[PDB]
Design a protein around this ligand. Structure first.
Ligand code: SF4
Lengths: 261, 1145, 261, 261
DNA sequence: CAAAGTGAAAAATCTAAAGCATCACCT
DNA sequence: AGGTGATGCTTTAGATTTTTCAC
């Protein structure tokens, strides 16, 4: 009876499509409060999170909590069936050895039911470090993805830096080096294109880039991103999903040798 | 000049006093003496006319051991041919320019082989320049080589007689060989020698009847060397322990006692009834006392044979370094000097090494070439071993271990040499007129070359010039060729998996083929009798009985063709199939004739009983460049200059460059031009060409190998006869008769093993450049004939069994149980009372003679009348080795293609008969995969149901994969180190390759960061390394963590691994935690899939083990064939209309 | 002296490209009824049928009953040279060596001709059994082709049923099972989108999913698709290309081999 | 030092995307008038001559006419960050060690800086011969690239047959042969799709297709390209944009293989 | 100045040739 | 909300090159 009704079709299939190259197996605690994602990555260097609570759903029936597991590539290939306009529902049972998925067309004649033989998992869960975040970059994630993929062609790693003058996205490569600068929006009337960085302290820290590119594969679900960060903490590249839920990606800092020779 | 003359003279006198120090007296008194040669060597001895006279020396002994020698001088020479009418003046000018070098100039015509009007009775006339010394020969050949090179260059492009000379020859093959064939001297045989004054040359005659021969003095010294851990073992760092050595059955030992703790006494090593070596102990307080005591012991020995394996890389530089530390002069003491190519030739002694025969010419497994493995192969019992890492402390704790080890190793070395290698040297001294060291070192292809010289001078034909490789090969359209070869080894395995003969399998036969056998059963048996043993049917008594037995068994197979019955693993082997086919069709290298030059012969009658329509296919791997763009790029090249190869020289121009760098320029420029222009630089196509062959030439290769095969058969027959005589004399027990009969049987065994080696050497001569008779069709046409034979076998056994492997000269196969395989024919003939006949070889022989009876066999019966008697011959004899108990066939990873030339077999007792082609016999690379191969080959033989056999192989695989999946925590790390020690050699320096990326170059870079550039200063480094996993987003070639980092102390070692790892967070640095399983897991997965998983999946086994996955192409077909929803043909559901063919519009 | 020109060059483009991955040498024949194609796969499974009306061509001059068997890969490569909205004519002779195709565009300037060499082969021809088939559906083309494309990876075997409820296609593999259910349409005027069924007897069969996948590339040939089948009977899916002609297709089903009992 | 900055970010972006694969190395010999890009091609047959004048810029300041040059691959990699109307800015010094590449957004928020290591070359200055051309055609870009791609998969040697009416391309392929017909356009309103031909003498030259495919990568430069040639001379392809300069494309004619006669 | 290699494995890495998911007009 | 093609983002099969074996 682990029921969930929801109007949209593109968002769930694309957020599960967002994990196609970073997670092959995860955990889905189907609870009365909702469903949640939390795991190591494949290389165990990052944290992923997707939150999806009950009041987003149209109807959402779930008496107990069950943490199921499925190959992401498998159901991702399965979830390329119905259109983006399709209205989706998923349920499970007490002996939910297989998932029970229905795609129903908007004109209500083309209805498809799907099942997947599942498998269990045992991956340790850790608490997310919750604290005050010094810098946040509330800038449209399409441009962020474009620029990070563009510098990925020349650079291999990135240097994040949000100081009092602005944000510096430095990236040294074997062929050449480059840096990205952005300041506050002042003449933009719309706030969806605006960037608003609350300012607490200047920072110079190093992170990975290809994992950041993998995180920026998931832009078209949101107009903008919050890049929440502090000193010597993993980055919080948060995408707003919808009123349905949200998601968090945590990329670990690169520990460069600060000591001299 | 004169300084060089006196240098050569004093070198000669030094070598002469050195030689007479060790016996081998200067025979200068008149008289005739029996003689038995052992070795040959060139030298210089002053003549009767004050000239520095080059010569060679022959070393003879007798039954008593009379060690003497005789000097043989002869004028060095080579032949030159010019155009017609340019020989007399050439002789005159060569006489008047090479005075002081040429003794005399003589016109010696020699018979060409590659010439139009082929052997019509025309003999080309050469000029022969008799020189004085080989050094004058070298300087004259260097003076003439670019002259004749430019002469043939204008000959290709299109006054002085230096231009009229257009050939130099026998320049690669040195003076030893042509003097050896000039005087018909064949080595190591009983010869009569007579000296009759210095005014006359010493005369040597072959004595033929005295096949009895003595044993020369042997030395089999057994080395041992303490090596410090993490160091190349060398004489400068450490010190010798002892030495033990064997002489003609009786051995000795000489032991340095300064590091040896205790004195020692006499040992005996008799593991076999016919094996016995007694010793004697000499103990030496000093290492100097060691080396001297050994050297005066070999002084009194008068030594001729001194053999230990791999001497020329680990013993003779070792011993001369030992003498150099103590200041002892080796050249005066013995004379052991570094060769120009890295050996130590002995001018008074003979030093062999079995690694030049056990690894190459013993046709044993390559990776099992070690002496323990050689003993377990031939003696059958492996001696005691030691680990060179820890044998220094092993020596210091107890010396008796090294004493017993060395004496056992030495006596086994003598037994291996005596039972196999004296047969080899007698074998190759039979007719090949070579000294044994370059017999072993130079290849069997060069041995065939030597036979070609031998029978060529018996043919009195000229030696063809050894050709040079020419680049920019242009086809009919002038199209640039990249690399040329044949259609290749037609090597295919149809099915794969386990095949044990006692474990039953499935057969699905055709009774129609059985009836097809039935009408010709009697014809098969008759052809088997009158053509194998040349025995007529009328002598056979019970022909009708075995005929009815064959009918009964073949009908008992025919009635039910689809059965489950025990397999009969029979190998359709045809050894010496190549020269058999050359015998059938009389295939000569310069009878290789095109039709435009076949018409140049005088035998092109319409009754074409001399042209064989032989067909073959040519593989073409070629550059897409055309003639026109080649012209543009060559004109662009010659238009301007080039960077100078000369360091700080003039600007480099095209017209005076040499050939190879111009070829490199051309291949680079055309390569990247077509890479940006034509999408491919190598295009593969297999055309067809037709070219016949002539038949009426001297046929020296053909009739030579025919004589050799007849000698093979009669030597084997006398081998059985005299081994039966030897056994009967063993039950008789008379000492003289048994000893001469062992002499005779080792003679016959020597000859047959010799000619087995040479038949295994015939085919390989032609696909190697710089030979006499390089071919592009000979091996091609013979492998096409063999391809036709093995294909016809593949349909034939495809009717009457299952063909396992189509391997060039042998077809592994399987038969049903009631198949006729071998029958004995009792006869009234006294000489052969019973004749044993193998049926399948007989029926394949009648098939191949029905298809392949060459009726063009024409022999020169009367050379005076040029009579060519045409006849028909059959010779295509097959054989089947003893029924094999086991037969394993591995497959490959990819779709539809399996392994080629890789398999293994087992005898009825399960002995390691044959195993080849795997990494387990490949040196270097990874060794843990080699040891799983060894374990699974041991575990193959158990079981009686194939399911349980696969289960046992699965159990041993589960063991050796749970060894590594448990991370080996409860087991030590040293054998783990040697298992994961991946070593890749530096063929060049680190800075030579530079921008090239590989795991070896990355390892060299890590050494450069670790210990500076001194560790990577040169090439040849045994760079040991492993693979790391913690580094992420990095190529597999990168992070090739070396094992050399482990010498560093833990703070510096850790700091370097942080530097290479780019991660300072880690604090514990165990070697198990720095591994990268992914390369190891993929290596073991590829190995397991090749060896067990894919063939068992092909053999309807559901899995080998659930711990391995499969490529999913086979997964689809297995899961669809495990369900009843099969595929359906159109015809049963859909009605037909008829067959319709489309015509031209 | 054979001429055949058709205004809708695009429909010819798509029909000649959508016959690729099952056959390399087609059996094209020319008669008084128009030009007709019947071709059967190299793997001895399935048959395709194409017919064209004589009046379907703007001019169709059939001088003789000529059949031509020519290759298909180079045919489609030289075919795709044509633009989308360009008129096509086909020319052949009573005796020649080369097929002639001329491509002409509506701007009367982008005009091209081609010369395709004719080849010769011997081929099998199979009879067409016509009988009362159980069920005929009138399915939209894009929806059925979308079903073929999406159900392609749930497995490799699809079972298909027809009932009073409608038509159902169920497929499964090692990963899971998916079934699509179609009801009946009465509330829509556009019959191309609408689905209508007929029935004679219950149908529970199965067919090769993979070959239907490689065949379904003929989606926009007809705006709808009609099917026709029975038990141990040819699958007749057919794509009526207006009054030009129609495509048809024949498939080998699966039959359940009897077991011991 | 050297400084220039222009607002149209698309122009140099597509120029570099055109020139990136055909030539690996070229010399950037700036002068007071501007820079001239001629490159000794690795093909050594298809020569390129690019001119660049200074009136099109908004700023153009330099101190010394450096005869510097860099690899086009790195230039393409660093201007792949550029978009369409982002302001392109470049800085340099008197010495050749490190360039500065600055991209400035049209909405005055996004900025960036990029640095590249330079290199020193030694290329002899090729001549650029100027002559009268017997045939010139103003060819619209799109359908010319279309016909290049048309004969690309069909043939490997295109002949040119420029006549009084127009130009004809034919070939001899393994599958067959064909021809495309060109003529003057008179009644078309849009001149970018109009094609006009200068003629003095018909010129027949056979040419490699995909080399021209490399040259036709400059299609977004303008809707119409100038194609000019004469007898016994390499052809010139002329691309023109704004008042920026001109690109000359000097491709040697491969003659007929005369060894067959 | 010297030197008996070349097909076959096998992988690393470098590619191009497609397969297929979004957009430049238009009611 | 679909119809023509661009335009790019994976994917997969060759291509190429270097040691390193067997014959
Ligand atoms: S095959 Fe006969 S005709 Fe031809 S070259 Fe030989 S002998 Fe002469």
């Amino acid at each position: 009876m682990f029921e969930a009704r929801l109007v949209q079709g593109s968002i769930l299939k694309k957020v599960l499509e967002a994990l196609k190259d970073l997670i092959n197996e995860a955990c889905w605690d189907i609870s009365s409060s909702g469903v949640n994602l939390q795991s190591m990555d494949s290389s165990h260097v990052s944290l992923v999170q997707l939150t999806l609570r009950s009041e987003g759903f149209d109807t959402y029936r779930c008496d107990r909590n069950l943490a199921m597991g499925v190959n992401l590539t498998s159901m991702s290939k399965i979830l390329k069936c119905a259109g983006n306009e399709d209205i989706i529902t998923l349920r499970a049972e007490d002996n939910a050895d297989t998932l029970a998925l229905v795609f129903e067309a908007p004109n209500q004649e083309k209805v498809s039911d799907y099942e997947m033989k599942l498998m269990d998992l045992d991956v340790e869960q850790l608490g997310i470090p919750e604290q005050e975040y010094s810098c946040v970059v509330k800038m449209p994630s399409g441009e962020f993805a474009r620029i990070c993929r563009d510098l990925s062609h020349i650079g291999d790693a990135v240097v994040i830096s949000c100081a009092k003058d602005g944000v510096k996205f430095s990236a040294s490569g074997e062929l050449g080096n480059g840096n990205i600068k952005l300041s506050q929006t002042s003449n933009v009337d719309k706030e969806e294109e605006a960037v608003t960085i609350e300012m607490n302290e200047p920072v110079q820290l190093t992170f990975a880039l290809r994992y950041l590119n993998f995180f920026t594969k998931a832009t078209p679900l949101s107009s903008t991103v919050t890049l929440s960060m502090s000193a010597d903490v993993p980055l919080v590249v948060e995408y707003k999903i919808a009123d349905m839920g949200h998601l968090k990606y945590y990329l670990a800092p690169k520990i460069e040798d600060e000591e001299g020779s | 000049s004169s300084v060089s003359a006196l240098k050569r003279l004093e070198r000669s006198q030094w070598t002469d006093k050195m030689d007479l120090r060790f016996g081998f007296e200067r025979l200068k008194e008149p008289g005739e003496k029996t003689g038995w040669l052992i070795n040959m060597h060139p030298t210089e001895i002053l003549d009767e006319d004050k000239r520095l006279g080059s010569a060679v020396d022959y070393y003879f002994i007798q039954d008593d051991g009379s060690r003497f020698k005789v000097a043989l001088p002869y004028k060095p020479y080579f032949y030159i041919a010019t155009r017609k009418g340019c020989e007399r003046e050439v002789s005159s000018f060569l006489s008047k320019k090479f005075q002081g070098k040429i003794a005399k100039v003589e016109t010696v015509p020699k018979e060409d082989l590659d010439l139009p009007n082929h052997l019509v009775g025309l003999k080309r006339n050469y000029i022969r320049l008799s020189f004085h010394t080989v050094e004058d020969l070298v300087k004259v050949r260097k003076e003439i080589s670019p002259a004749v090179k430019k002469n043939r260059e204008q000959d290709h492009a299109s006054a002085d007689q230096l231009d009229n000379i257009v050939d130099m020859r026998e320049y690669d093959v040195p003076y030893h060989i042509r003097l050896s064939i000039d005087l018909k001297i064949h080595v190591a045989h009983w010869y009569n020698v007579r000296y009759r004054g210095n005014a006359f040359p010493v005369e040597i005659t072959r004595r033929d009847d005295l096949v009895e021969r003595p044993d020369p003095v042997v030395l089999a010294f057994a080395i041992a060397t303490t090596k410090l851990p993490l160091k190349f073992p060398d004489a400068e760092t450490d010190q010798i322990m002892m030495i033990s050595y064997m002489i003609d059955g009786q051995g000795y030992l000489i032991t340095n006692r300064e590091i040896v703790s205790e004195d020692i006494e006499d040992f005996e090593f008799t593991p076999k009834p016919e094996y016995e070596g007694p010793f004697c102990v000499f103990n030496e307080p000093d290492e100097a006392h060691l080396i001297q005591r050994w050297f005066e012991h070999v002084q009194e020995t008068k030594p001729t044979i001194m053999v230990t394996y791999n001497g020329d890389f680990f013993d003779w530089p070792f011993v001369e370094a030992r003498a150099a530390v103590h200041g002892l002069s080796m050249q005066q003491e013995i004379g052991f000097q570094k060769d120009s190519q890295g050996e130590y030739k002995a001018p008074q002694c003979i030093h062999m090494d079995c690694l030049r025969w056990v690894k190459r010419d013993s046709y044993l497994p390559v990776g099992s070439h070690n002496l323990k493995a050689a003993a377990k192969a031939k003696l059958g019992y492996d001696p005691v071993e030691l680990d060179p890492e820890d044998m220094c402390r092993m020596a210091t704790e107890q010396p008796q271990t090294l004493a017993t080890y060395s004496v056992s190793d030495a006596v086994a070395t003598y037994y291996l040499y005596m039972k196999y290698v004296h047969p080899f040297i007698f074998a190759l001294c039979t007719i090949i007129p070579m000294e044994p060291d370059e017999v072993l070192r130079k290849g069997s292809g060069t041995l065939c070359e030597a036979l070609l010289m031998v029978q060529a001078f018996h043919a009195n034909i000229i030696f063809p010039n050894k050709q040079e490789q020419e680049f920019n090969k242009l086809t009919d359209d002038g199209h640039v060729l990249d690399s040329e070869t044949y259609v290749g080894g037609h090597v295919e395995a149809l099915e794969s998996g386990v095949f044990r003969s006692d474990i039953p399998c499935r057969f699905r036969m055709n009774p129609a083929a059985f009836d097809f056998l039935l009408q010709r059963v009697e014809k098969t048996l008759r052809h088997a009798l009158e053509e194998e043993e040349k025995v007529p049917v009328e002598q056979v008594t019970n022909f009708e009985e075995v005929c009815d037995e064959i009918k009964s068994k073949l009908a008992s197979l025919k009635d039910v063709p689809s059965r489950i019955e025990c397999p009969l693993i029979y190998h359709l082997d045809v050894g010496a199939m190549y020269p058999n086919i050359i015998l059938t069709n009389r295939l000569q290298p310069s009878a290789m004739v095109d039709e435009a030059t076949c018409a140049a012969c005088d035998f092109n009658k319409p009754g074409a009983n001399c042209q064989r329509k032989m067909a073959w296919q040519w593989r073409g791997e070629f550059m897409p460049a055309s003639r026109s763009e080649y012209h543009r790029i060559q004109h662009q090249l010659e238009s301007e200059k080039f960077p100078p190869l000369f360091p700080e020289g003039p600007a480099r121009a095209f017209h005076e460059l040499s050939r190879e760098e111009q070829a490199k320029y051309e291949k680079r420029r055309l390569a990247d031009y077509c890479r940006k222009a034509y999408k491919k630089i190598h295009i593969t196509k297999v055309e067809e060409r037709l070219t016949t062959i002539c038949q009426r030439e001297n046929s020296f290769y053909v009739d030579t190998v025919r004589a050799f095969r007849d000698r093979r058969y009669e030597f084997k027959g006398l081998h059985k006869v005299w081994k039966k005589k030897l056994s009967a004399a063993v039950e008789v027990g008379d000492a003289a008769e048994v000893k001469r009969c062992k002499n005779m049987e080792v003679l016959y065994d020597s000859l047959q093993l010799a000619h087995k080696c040479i038949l295994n050497s015939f085919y390989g001569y032609v696909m190697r450049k710089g030979a006499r008779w390089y071919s592009m069709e000979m091996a091609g046409i013979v492998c096409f004939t063999g391809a036709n034979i093995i294909t016809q076998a593949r349909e034939l056994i495809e009717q009457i069994g299952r063909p396992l492997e189509l391997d060039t000269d042998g077809i592994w196969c399987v038969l049903p149980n009631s198949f006729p395989e071998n029958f004995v024919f009792k006869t009234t003939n006294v000489k052969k009372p019973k004749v044993t006949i193998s049926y399948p070889g007989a029926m394949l022989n009648i098939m191949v003679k029905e298809g392949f009876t060459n009726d063009q066999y024409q022999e020169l019966a009367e050379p005076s009348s040029l009579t060519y008697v045409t006849r028909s011959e059959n010779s295509i004899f097959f054989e089947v080795d003893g029924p094999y108990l086991a037969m394993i066939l591995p497959a490959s990873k990819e779709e539809g293609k399996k392994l080629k030339k890789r398999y293994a077999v087992f005898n009825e007792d399960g002995s390691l008969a044959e195993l080849k082609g795997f990494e387990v016999k490949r040196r270097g690379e990874l060794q843990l995969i080699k040891i799983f191969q060894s374990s699974v080959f041991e575990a193959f033989l158990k079981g009686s149901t194939l399911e349980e056999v696969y289960g046992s192989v699965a159990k041993v695989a589960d063991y050796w994969l749970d060894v590594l999946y448990s991370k080996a925590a409860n087991m030590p790390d040293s054998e783990l180190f040697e298992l994961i020690s991946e070593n890749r050699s530096m063929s060049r320096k680190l800075e030579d390759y530079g921008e090239q990326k590989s795991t070896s170059i990355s390892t060299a870079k890590r050494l450069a960061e670790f210990l500076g550039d001194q560790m990577v200063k040169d090439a040849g480094l045994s760079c040991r390394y492993i693979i790391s996993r913690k580094p992420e987003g990095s190529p597999v070639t990168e992070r090739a963590i070396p094992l050399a980092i482990f010498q560093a102390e833990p703070t510096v070692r850790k700091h370097f691994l942080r530097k290479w790892l780019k991660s300072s967070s880690l604090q514990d640095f165990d070697i198990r935690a720095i591994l990268d399983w992914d390369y190891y897991i993929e290596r073991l997965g590829s190995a397991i899939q090749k060896i067990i998983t894919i063939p068992a999946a092909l053999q309807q086994v559901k899995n080998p083990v659930p711990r391995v996955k499969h490529p999913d192409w086979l997964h689809k077909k297995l899961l669809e064939k495990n369900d009843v929803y099969k595929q359906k043909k159109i015809s049963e559901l859909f009605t037909l209309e008829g067959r319709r063919q489309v015509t031209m519009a």
